[PDB]
Design a protein around this ligand. Structure first.
Ligand SMILES: Cc1cc2nc3c(=O)[nH]c(=O)nc-3n(C[C@H](O)[C@H](O)[C@H](O)COP(=O)(O)OP(=O)(O)OC[C@H]3O[C@@H](n4cnc5c(N)ncnc54)[C@H](O)[C@@H]3O)c2cc1C
Ligand SMILES: Cc1cc2nc3c(=O)[nH]c(=O)nc-3n(C[C@H](O)[C@H](O)[C@H](O)COP(=O)(O)OP(=O)(O)OC[C@H]3O[C@@H](n4cnc5c(N)ncnc54)[C@H](O)[C@@H]3O)c2cc1C
Lengths: 544, 532
């Protein structure tokens, strides 16, 4: 159904993701008419939860967002300052604080497994994983990958964390002076070990750098922007102050967009336009000063005063933006600003063998939540933290969670539609799970029930997992999209338009900035109420 | 004594030719029902003789040749000799890298021009100085890569390795980081003596190659400059599609010695029957049945080996990591069959004739590259098939998501996007092309379990740290790694030939060195070093 603009203002939100839904909450709280246009048959976008039909209450897994490193909170839903504060307040604003259950980043019982170079160990046993055979000095092994990488990113990350506390941008300025570096080129040409390590003051070799990447991140991560590596350290809480409180949503992250879709309806009506793929955006007349915006979605023209686009950048490259009058830098930013891939494989088993089972030698796994890591194709294993300590614990496992090259390669085995490749994938995954945990292949096969795989890099609605900028992207093209187009009536938003890529808070920040520019240009009288309800700044810290 | 060749690609078929010429028993194991691997030609069933297009290999920058199949020295000499060895010289028809008549189109930043008109494509609005625009991207990139390429080209002529040694000293650079931290423009350009900014570098990448290329190894950019002949080359393609090469080699093998192919057999495990016994054979679990061999030559792409069980192959720790870290690149192609060769005979919305015969058109729109058919021209039935899109790196990752969905709704979205971009690049109405469309065929090599990527595309440091590990054998010297990845001519057929040459060389060296003179005499004294 069509909406209605009291005062002549109707905002057209493109995309029913968390970014678009957040824009709706803000506009709805400010008595601004809006309309959400969604290409698919569902809302939530990359908050995608899959429920196995042959499972119980907690036999699901999040294909997209699953964990949230929130600041500490009281029992009433007030969150302390922090990177993810904006997310925590959104949960409280929707009455979801009681649904935020603990997420165990590390195993709540026995440590998770590490399996690299044929060497199997548990996290904390200080194993070398045969690094000496690779040529890694003995001094490096004793220091550790976590300690070395933290020393290189620390200075940058600390400066950005100071921007958030002290309300400055100098930290970003210094970061941008180094944005031309990839994480690799920074280690190869700039980084020098801290004197406290007792190492030679010299740059690392390729062998050492690839050794850092292996245990620190994913294959090919370090070839992308250094800026991304520092930002991901801040989001993960690797270099901050206040302790982080990992949380996930009871029932899957899909509860968040579902609750927001109900909140937006309880007041008035339904402002969603589903199954309508935006094919063109632009001013009705680019020369007229007060021309509205036209959004051709689902083959039907729709008029709006302003448009807030949460579409991922590769999708805008498929939309006709002729009459949107983007400048030459914004046009190029849509193409060059890089995205990253990712795949997830969820398997439903007959039992939570990882919690109660045992290996070939009788040793109990005793894993509750947490993760296991390996250099095998599956790279990462994530055990369910939801449903533990319940009548029906979860039988669902994330048998694979890959990034960058590991996701690009594995993706070819996903979504093929061929029976042969669905079985190859299953045998490969179980085989890697079998090696990582020290069990026979048949032990897991006898417990398999259903398999679900997803490749965000082959999804036409996202065209990539998330933004993952390469070197120089932030310093040359990011700013162009932070200002509007189409005579100020087209606002770019989405997780890509933020410094928290691959996080929900990034989508929220982009919506905040989009509404801020909208109110600033149409109804500045609402800025005080806007600041009071949604914050004075997107990112700079502030008390609840 | 019997060698097990894994993979019926051009690399495996070449290994078979060599072993067959040296009277060495072999057996080819192929997972699919076809031979040629990435030599993939698609024939539209509703088309004519030349209504096909090469999904993989399609063009070959061969050295100049006489009328009897003798090729002068050059990077692609080994390929030319293979065509002659198979009696295919008369089938090598011209390939037009540039339009054989009027130049191809360029469409960047909304500015449309023809190749050669020296358009700036509105670069001044991007901040590109007038001095850079006058010099040009081609002239700048050639100035930065020239030194490296010349040193490597001298290695091939003078038979040395000093050039490669110098290249490896700089392998830690990506092409981007080289411009940002080391490169200084030649004083002859009249530019400031300082490294290029990000804006300028992305401007170079936009017109020189594909989105995201410059984030990968500098070495790869230098090697691809040598393969393309940027150092004269005689571009050629195969009459009827590149599939003729593997098909012709399969016939050459079925007549002499009988058939020796094992099709529809997916290799799932490789290793010694007993890793402790000194003279243990190699076992290859293919199609669920064990097969014994004396030596195994694997042409499987590196990501595929990561899905094979190599427990009893006794790889060292560097080889294990090389399989994972050695990076591959993506690529997609979209071939469209039209009612007529409108690009050759049609006209735009303003009446101006396209007048395009062969060649290529370039744009910053999602399709990036358009390739017009050079095969079938000057025939009763010229080709009506167009390569509407040919992407690399990031352009392929994005487009790939719209390919292979299996859903009719999104296959039409893709078709509308492609035709719409073709409409803008050529200055025609969308309906002008739609009225002439007949069939569409798209392929995403980054979504294919038999390749798991288009080809090797190493990142910084891969050549200098991990490439060597896979060039030595495993499994007590009974497992030899081959394929285009194991070469310095990635994404080229000659690279697969070089890998096969080196694999056979090590095999003969360790089992029957008495055959090395015949091996050298028939297939060359070196994989890469030039010869007559
Ligand atoms: C594997 C993975 C794991 C993640 N894990 C976490 C985590 O643990 N914690 C966390 O905080 N974040 C996580 N994230 C990030 C989070 O999921 C995203 O950052 C956030 O959901 C992005 O929201 P958005 O609104 O910007 O984009 P999206 O959610 O992608 O929304 C875009 C919307 O636009 C629609 N659309 C697309 N094309 C069109 C079109 N042509 N016309 C109209 N509509 C269109 C889509 O269908 C979708 O509804 C993860 C992401 C991934 C990929
Ligand atoms: C888009 C594109 C364009 C190209 N264009 C050109 C060009 O213009 N000129 C040029 O010279 N080169 C070009 N190339 C390069 C050329 O096509 C390849 O370099 C060459 O064909 C690779 O041969 P190979 O034997 O190394 O691998 P492949 O041809 O991939 O052969 C591997 C074989 O192994 C099989 N196999 C896979 N998995 C298994 C398994 N588990 N068990 C058993 N068998 C298995 C495959 O089916 C295949 O038969 C191009 C490549 C691409 C992708």
């Amino acid at each position: 159904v069509p909406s209605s603009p009291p005062g002549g203002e109707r905002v057209g939100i493109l995309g029913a993701g968390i970014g678009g839904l957040y824009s709706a909450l803000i506009l709805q709280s400010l008595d601004v008419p809006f309309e959400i246009i969604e290409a698919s048959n569902r809302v939530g976008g990359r908050l995608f939860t899959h429920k196995f039909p042959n499972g119980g209450k907690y036999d699901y897994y999040d294909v997209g967002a699953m964990r949230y490193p929130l600041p500490k909170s009281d029992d009433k839903g007030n969150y302390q300052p922090g990177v993810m504060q904006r997310v925590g307040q959104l949960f409280t604003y929707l009455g979801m604080h009681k649904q935020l259950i603990p997420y165990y980043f590390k195993s709540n019982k026995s440590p998770g497994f590490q399996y690299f170079n044929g060497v199997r160990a548990r996290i904390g046993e200080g194993s070398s994983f045969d690094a000496p055979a690779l040529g890694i000095n003995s001094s490096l092994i004793d220091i550790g990958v976590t300690k070395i990488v933290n020393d290189a990113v620390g200075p940058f990350a600390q400066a950005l964390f100071d921007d958030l506390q002290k309300h400055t941008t100098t930290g970003w300025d210094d970061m941008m002076k180094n944005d031309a570096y990839s994480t690799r080129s920074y280690f190869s040409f700039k980084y020098l070990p801290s004197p406290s390590f007792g190492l030679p003051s010299e740059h690392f070799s390729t062998r050492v750098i690839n050794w850092l990447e292996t245990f620190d991140k994913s294959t090919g991560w370090y070839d992308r922007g250094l800026t991304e590596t520092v930002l991901e350290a801040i989001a993960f809480g690797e270099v901050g102050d206040g302790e982080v409180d990992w949380r996930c949503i009871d029932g899957g992250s899909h509860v968040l967009p579902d609750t927001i879709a109900a909140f937006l309806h309880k007041k008035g009506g339904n402002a969603f336009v589903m199954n309508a793929s935006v094919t063109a955006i632009g001013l009705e007349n680019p020369n007229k000063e007060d021309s509205p915006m036209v959004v051709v979605a689902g083959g039907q023209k729709r008029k709006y005063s302003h448009v807030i686009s949460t579409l991922p950048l590769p999708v805008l490259r498929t939309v006709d933006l002729k009459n949107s009058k983007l400048d030459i830098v914004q046009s190029n930013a849509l193409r060059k600003l890089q995205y990253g891939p990712s795949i997830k494989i969820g398997i439903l088993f007959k039992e939570p063998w990882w919690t109660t089972g045992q290996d070939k030698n009788g040793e109990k796994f005793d894993l509750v939540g947490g993760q296991s890591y390996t250099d095998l194709p599956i790279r990462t294993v994530v055990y369910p933290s939801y449903g533990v300590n319940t009548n029906a614990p979860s039988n669902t496992l994330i048998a694979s969670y890959c990034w960058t090259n590991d996701a690009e390669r594995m993706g070819s085995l996903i979504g093929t539609g061929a029976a042969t490749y669905e079985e190859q994938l299953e045998h490969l995954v179980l085989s890697n799970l079998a090696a990582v945990h020290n069990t026979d292949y048949q032990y897991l096969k006898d417990r398999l029930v259903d398999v679900h795989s997803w490749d965000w890099n082959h999804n036409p609605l996202t065209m990539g997992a998330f933004a993952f900028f390469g070197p120089g992207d932030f310093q040359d093209l990011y700013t162009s999209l932070n200002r509007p187009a189409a005579n100020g009536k087209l606002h770019f938003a989405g997780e890509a338009l933020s410094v928290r890529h691959a996080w929900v808070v990034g989508a929220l920040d982009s919506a905040w900035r989009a509404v801020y520019n909208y109110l600033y240009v149409t109804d500045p009288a609402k800025l005080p109420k806007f600041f009071e309800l949604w914050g004075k700044n997107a990112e700079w810290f502030e008390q609840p």
